[PDB]
Design a protein around this ligand. Structure first.
Ligand code: NAD
Lengths: 494, 494, 494, 494
């Protein structure tokens, strides 16, 4: 029961957000923001660059000064503000969902129920942690009194992707602000709109100027200025592993700022013969095709045991033929477009390599329509580990299905990749559930389900799928800087 | 009451330690290890390089495989082994202390009571944490059972400095092994001897082969091979901020391995007029001059309030004249040599700059002796913030004394640096103790004391003085990799 | 800036709250509820007894059954409901404050700003903890998978006092519900009104029937039925140590239910000569006289160092003469009446004993008015430890001032009591602040302040001032029951 | 591979242990200690009573004074002492195991490998926690600095049972001492010998006098003096629920001391048709018969699903016939005697009631031998919930086997008891493993195994099976007393 999407939305927030005020780009330049499904320009946004980032950083630095409103404020007041922001997102839910679907080529019903719902739940979760961030009193040797302070890291630059614009935005600012940090968020050049709208909500909630600064623009420009900035204490990034590498290097060549990364993946999904077949097929299906396959945790490597392999493929191909491509804002459409032309052509090149390397094409395998960047739901069987589509992150509606015999070889193959964001295991065996999930080198491992991500759960990947964890209890520790204070006393007592 | 140092020590362990076996360098090359105080060659050690590192990493990777002895072993057994290693250090305390003093130009009584004592205490502390590393069960949304596993990070490459050879060695392997990791330690080319001896103790304690691999050699060679290795999950480094930068970059250009850094500093030591003057002078003195000023936390910026400034200088110069330079193994000597020629000339160049920039030379200010790299205990007053000796880490027996008037300006000046490892505050005012220590941007802040570092306390710096914390409860989290396991269940209950 | 109190308040909720429905007492009996200041009857409330308690317990037991709405509900939804209840208290803030002031003889401005403000803040704090109550995964010996569940304790009977009716009510249900427990609250017979009003707000917020059951009535009847009930898993009590004893015994003679107690006190307040005199006098004043001295943490033993003793007494008597007794609802009145006649006569008898035992009467020392139970702000100097007013909890506007010479004897005297709820220390000496507070046997120790109680802080007393802690992180653990689940697995891995 | 037990053991420690010195009972009286298997007197021990307890408490109080050796000592030194005590138990392992088997009628091989092994592991676990007991720094509202201290509870009286003498002894003193408490242990009158021997080991390890005081004697005398003592801050008890009630009452009538209880049980063991039958039969067998059925967690209610019921009973009767009764010190004997005559006659009366109420006698059902208190391994099938042997704790080699059909009714029946110490679930179904264990009201729930208790796991029961948890992280919090210290500061910063 989702309301009707808005049609005539007029855009209001298109500028750079610094100190709760709207600024034009120092350069004067602007960049176009389009609708993925129709290719028509939604509006133009100020093009932030290095000089715009420098202004944002100084504002964030000033807001983090000892004695400033944001730092003397009660931790509980910090939580109340986050909850108030969630209230404003709840109010503007329809507008944000429509805007999100329009700019991101995202299905509206999902944007309204899933994305916006997660946005609200994440903020409310973060709100609760604010006055619960605690330090320790340590019984060290000698006559001393020692305690620690879980202080904020400081000025946090946060660079986010285009697949879940608003959600990624709140995933970053939620924990950061809950801990007392000041941020400089740089949204993807493809989807800055919902992020900019949040600026007005952040100002309306009552957050002190400089606590949240938003600088729209491109990556090599505004993003790089953040990663290499000498006054940014930490950079949080979510996107391609290729850029993630550049971020960590930039951090090293400059200020040695803390770095947290959430990169892509090539998540394996192992289905054993003793598993519930129906359950496995549906979860494995959604696991790869959700949001036109543009998910970090996409189950791009589906390992199925020989005895149930042929059958599993039949249902997978069957299930993949039940899609209606079109405008994500139009009722009935069950699959929208890819974000842009670059992404669209990347998926086609990979599909083509799959064909050329002997992969068995079951579904689609080509483009669709003449307006927008659509791709037919593609399925490939008899996919081998050495294949290009089995190694590289496609980030498109393309499913890979492999065959396995032994428990040991399938685990080895599942772990043979530089990625390790997530994985799925389907079995009704208690032992395989526990031991196999312990053996897989992935940040999150789902058993008899998939894609289940929650606010109270830490999320991140092993190996090259990222550094650190987000959300949950552990995620909040990534946004604090520990300080040990040791005081000499006459005589200590237990 | 310290025993007499050994004289004829014969060296036994000079090879590369891989899989509990001793290997010659693949290249065949060896490098000389000298005695800082006399300049005479102690012996020669195998020169490890990239090919030697590759062997060590594969051994560490093999020891970390699912089902291997080290990973199936009880966490409690892991602690018992660490305690057994401490027992062996306790037994070989005299040998290790003598060897440490000889190779590092370190005063024997200190090496025996302080360094070796800290070595034992650190291992015993780590031992206790082993079976106490726990995960969580998270009450997430929906019908799911979710729990986390605090798994080891994996293969950890650890690069350590020459100022506290054995202590740095155990500071790294202690937490790592306590958590279940396998390591590849690369000691400083100047001081590999005590580290190599530990190899025999690690094998004798009963640790499975491959758990600890030690590869002596140079930095740009063996060290760089570790930081850029594609199969190393994490690199832990302690040394210069210059190399720290290279480490983080290498980690980015290659595998995106986790990085923890403990770099130098320029620790400010603020003394207010209301402080206990005697206490302040002694702590501030030891804080800069300990181990010939070769400490990461050296209080190289002593800010004293005007009203007590002149008097403080007098006592400081007075105290600095009570030193006997000479062989650290000879009774009566209260100050040994610097590690090598490079370090010695770095200190002289900085002393010289202090003279040329108008700093007031109170003590020494020049070299000493003809055998070894000794330097006279130097003291400078009327030092200004812009001075080279007030900005760069000297790492030599050179003290800087500054003057301050206001509480706000002194805090600003204390924080105006890219460093932030530690700081000291001397005052009898409850409010300044708490508020000023909260305002200083340093990892550890001592009040009415200094240099007090303990095993149960997390240690690391803000800004460019490092990433992450070592030891203590927080330090052990830096050696784990969190995994979230979500299981679909029929119905959840609180 | 507090709004004008309501005058004609008509009462609506006067029945027993069970399963979100209003019930008449099974016996048919009712009991009168009066206004402390005027002695006039506000209304009549159903007199709950054992049979009414049995109905409430069965309702709470049914709401706690596996599979019931309250137990399958998301922990986050549990938090959202608590925040919604706080929203309803915010809305009915004027009504609750007026009603509280009328029924409790409590000053309106305080009831509106302090009591109701604390009510809201406590609920919001509890709300945040709901989905953050986590268990552990334990690396035990052998091949097993072990994790714990922090389950709710179950049916919690909560008996509260009359001095802070609404606040005590939320202090109990907040943590309990946040953790998933079902409760049976039994408010003081003198002040059931605001608690009953909360019933309607609890039903309106959306809490499942049976989660909160409120049974007004007397102590030896309804209260005793709760403490000795065979199906109540835990009893939380706040009141006199005399009844606390009976509660623990009842728990032993019956079901061996968990017991938490927050009893009275005789809180010492030590003022050293080096302390800020003004600060000390004001805090020490409010510490004893707040809410007509009817506070658990009342600083009923003020130890002042000889050198500043005479001067301290002058200001204390001076400050105590600035009060206007009258109706707590009338502007200008700075001191309301005692709760009832029993309490009034208890305070007089103690005041009389103070005079008879040689205590130096500085202020009042007698009753006031003819309508209501008022008492003149009394102050006594030269009070000795053996005096009755220096040993027993007065719970009235009566301050005791003592003299001390040595640091050791004052600590011994401060600890020489069966109480130990709280204490205060006034000094500008860093060492006395830390070491003396460590030496005092009190649950909460304030330094240079007093009466500062917050939601994020655990509160409880040492010795006979109570068992367990309330609020804060530790307080929430008192509302959970740990369960260890050990599963046999083929092979364990770290 | 267990060594031969000792034969001529001469007893040395038979007095009351106070202040590391051996005292005769104030009364002069002594009591005989026998060998359960032969009925011959091993020796005589001083009979401690109230006056002996008063001396022990004063010694423990004196050792806990601020500034005493035990309280100023480093937490790490406290751990080192515990590990040293474990070293001494390791050394005297043969003596303690022999002595334990002789005094407790315990099989020697088990006493040597299981009991003594657990003794050592528990101490080593506790040792590690000592310097890791930490407090918090709380970000409360307003300008204040707040931190907590996890102080020791104080003087802890500990009363232990006769079934696992030495193990219970260390289970109590381990955590207590690790946290800094001083204790007054009162071992069972039937088995004081190994506890008294520990006194010499505690003195030899270097523990300060008064830290551990041991007062042998009877329950209504020495034990009751501890539970009702006015200067004991906490009483820890393990034994019958009947005495547990008296302990909690005594605590209420006197000082309101904290109380922790570990009482008996009637642990249900549910076996579903889909479980591994062999595994289930063996675990369930050891679960009831271990140590002649004298275990708190004995699986005295074995629920087996109808479809596999008859078959399960055959194997259970089969397995129960493979026992050789005799002296626990003699090779080949696989079942020793009950502790004494009282216990022996309690088991017979229950066996008899089983016969009279229609239970189907499969095995034994009567006594054995003429020297000692032996009983034949008894098994009963077709046992109904209303039967006396299905409700009361037998504490003898008697197994009850029931039949069940539905998942819901079996859980209801498993929970229909005032006990709730532990439970066992056998099934290969992932869902039943998780959901059923969540639904059972027992402190510990084993899946596909049983009797697996470890040091790093918290242990305690729901309902009348006890209060609080022992061992593990949570268990150590039961041995601390939280203190909140709030300091007023000029301005707070996050
Ligand atoms: N933080 C500390 O405790 C500490 C310790 C030693 C040195 N320093 C500082 O650094 C200055 C110079 O000392 P240094 O050159 O011996 O220190 P360094 O940082 O070069 O040496 C530390 C360690 O890192 C290795 N290393 C060096 N080059 C490397 C490279 N390219 N890649 C990977 N690893 C490499 C070394 O071989 C050694 O094991 C000093 O004057 C002082 O300021 C600080």
């Amino acid at each position: 029961d989702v309301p009707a999407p808005l049609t005539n939305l007029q855009f209001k927030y298109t500028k750079i957000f610094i100190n709760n005020e709207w600024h034009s780009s120092v350069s004067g330049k602007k960049f176009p923001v389009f609708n993925p499904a129709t290719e028509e320009k939604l509006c133009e946004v100020e093009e932030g660059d290095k000089e715009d980032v420098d202004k944002a950083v100084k504002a964030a630095r000033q807001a983090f000064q000892i004695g400033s409103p944001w730092r003397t404020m009660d931790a509980s007041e910090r939580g109340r503000l986050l909850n108030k922001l969630a209230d404003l997102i709840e109010r503007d839910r329809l507008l944000l969902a429509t805007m999100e679907a329009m700019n991101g080529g995202k299905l509206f019903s999902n944007a309204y129920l899933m994305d916006l719902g997660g946005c609200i739940k994440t903020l409310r979760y973060c709100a609760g942690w604010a006055d619960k961030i605690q330090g320790r009193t340590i019984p060290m040797d000698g006559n001393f009194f020692t305690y620690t302070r879980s202080e904020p890291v400081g000025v946090c630059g946060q660079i986010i992707p285009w697949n879940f614009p608003l959600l990624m935005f709140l995933w970053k600012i939620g924990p950061a602000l809950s801990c007392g940090n000041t941020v400089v968020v740089k949204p993807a050049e493809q989807t800055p709109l919902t992020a900019l709208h949040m600026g007005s909500l952040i100002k309306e909630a009552g957050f002190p100027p400089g606590v949240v600064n938003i600088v729209p623009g491109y990556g090599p420009t505004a993003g790089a200025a953040i990663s290499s900035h000498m006054d940014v204490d930490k950079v949080a990034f979510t996107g391609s592993t290729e850029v993630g590498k550049l971020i960590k290097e930039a951090a090293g060549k400059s200020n040695l700022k803390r770095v947290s990364l959430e990169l892509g993946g090539k998540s394996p999904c192992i289905v054993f013969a003793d598993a519930d077949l129906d359950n496995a097929v549906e979860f494995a299906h959604q696991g790869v095709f959700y949001h036109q396959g543009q998910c970090c945790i996409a189950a791009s490597r589906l390992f199925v045991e020989e005895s149930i392999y042929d059958e599993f493929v039949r249902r997978s191909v069957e299930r993949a033929k039940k899609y209606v491509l079109g405008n994500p804002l139009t009722p009935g459409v069950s699959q929208g477009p890819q974000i842009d032309k670059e992404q669209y052509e990347k998926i086609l090149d990979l599909i083509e390599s799959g064909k050329k390397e002997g992969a068995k094409l079951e579904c689609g395998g080509g483009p669709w329509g003449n307006k927008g960047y659509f791709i037919q739901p593609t399925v490939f069987s008899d996919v081998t580990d050495d294949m290009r589509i089995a190694k590289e992150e496609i980030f498109g509606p393309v499913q890979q299905i492999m065959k396995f015999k032994s428990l040991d070889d399938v685990i080895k193959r599942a772990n043979n990749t530089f990625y390790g964001l997530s994985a799925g295991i389907f079995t009704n065996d208690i032992d395989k559930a526990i031991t196999v999930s312990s053996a897989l080198q992935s940040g999150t491992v789902w058993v008899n389900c998939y894609s289940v991500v929650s606010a109270q759960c830490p999320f991140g990947g092993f190996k090259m799928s990222g550094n650190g964890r987000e959300l949950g209890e552990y995620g909040f520790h990534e946004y604090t800087e520990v300080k040990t204070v040791t005081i000499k006393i006459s005589q200590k007592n237990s």
